[PDB]
């Protein structure tokens, strides 16, 4: 009789801020996970946040490749892909050369996903 696996440990990092601990169940839809995260952290605008993998891949969570999540793995929170696309589009015609350089570099580096493309 194997022990239950419904409980997992995972830390969600932030840029410049230390992580917080919560249990995430991948069986439930991502909408439910986002709603539970927002309820736990008392954060509004659930549609403006998403999840990503902080490993060498630096990819977001996908329905076909979500099994790479393992206990005791560094994961950091990022901005939602819609907001990232909007800010990249805004900075495409920006007045700063360095901003254009970094935006194009980030777009080229993070262009390995099909659905977000």
């Amino acid at each position: 009789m194997p022990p239950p696996a419904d409980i997992v440990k995972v830390a969600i990092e932030w840029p410049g801020a230390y992580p917080k601990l919560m249990e995430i169940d991948q069986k439930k839809p991502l909408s439910a996970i986002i709603k539970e995260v927002c309820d736990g952290w008392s954060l509004a605008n659930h549609e403006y946040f998403a999840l990503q993998h902080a490993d060498s891949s630096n990819f977001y969570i996908t329905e076909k490749n979500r099994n790479e999540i393992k206990n005791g793995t560094i994961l950091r929170l990022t901005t939602s892909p819609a907001q990232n696309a909007q800010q990249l589009h805004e900075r495409i015609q920006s007045s700063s050369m360095d901003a254009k350089l970094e935006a194009l570099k980030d777009l080229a580096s993070l262009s390995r996903d099909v659905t977000f493309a």
Binding site: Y18, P19, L21, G72
Partner: protein, 181 residues
């Protein structure tokens, strides 16, 4: 009510994994299991103030020096565990910890607790330390070290006996509330 970030460090091979397991499961396993990193978020309220204990596990391996030094700057509090009667531990502390924490941030409260004190009841470690011609650190030198590292009040807690740990955390919080000018 102000939740503050925390980092827990210590000397190599002191029982960090055992402490983490005790904190997460209320047990005391003598078995040693390798651990890369851990982070515990505890919601503990003391003296009417709600501060979240953002525990952080650290590794003393040479490969992860950059990872450990990433969070060292701008740290607000440290939880350091070291051997009380290890002259090499004192030498390492004096070489690495105190000068850096003093030069970088003069106004960061630091909590220090001495460990490896329940081994006195075991004659094995006494014989091991006896054959090398080593003597226990004198209490006066230990008190001088405690008072010379910019510590308001030095206190120790026992993990095997489960005595004073909560008191140590509470007094550290009180010292943070009313630190030196």
């Amino acid at each position: 009510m102000q939740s503050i970030k925390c980092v827990v460090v210590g000397d190599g091979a002191v029982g960090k994994t055992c402490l983490l397991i005790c904190y997460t499961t209320n047990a005391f396993p003598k078995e040693y299991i390798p651990t890369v990193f851990d982070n515990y978020s505890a919601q503990s309220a003391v003296d009417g103030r709600t501060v979240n204990l953002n525990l952080w596990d650290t590794a003393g391996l040479e490969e992860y020096d950059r990872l450990r030094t990433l969070s060292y700057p701008q740290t607000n509090v440290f939880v350091i565990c070291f051997s009380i009667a290890s002259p090499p531990s004192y030498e390492n502390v004096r070489h690495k910890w105190h000068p850096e924490v003093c030069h970088h941030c003069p106004d960061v409260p630091i909590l220090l607790v001495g460990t490896k004190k329940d081994l006195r009841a075991q004659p094995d470690t006494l014989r091991r330390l006896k054959e090398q011609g080593q003597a226990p650190i004198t209490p006066q030198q230990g008190q001088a070290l405690a008072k010379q590292i910019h510590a308001v009040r030095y206190l120790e807690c026992s993990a095997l006996q489960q005595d004073g740990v909560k008191e140590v955390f509470a007094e550290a919080v009180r010292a943070v509330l009313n630190p030196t000018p």
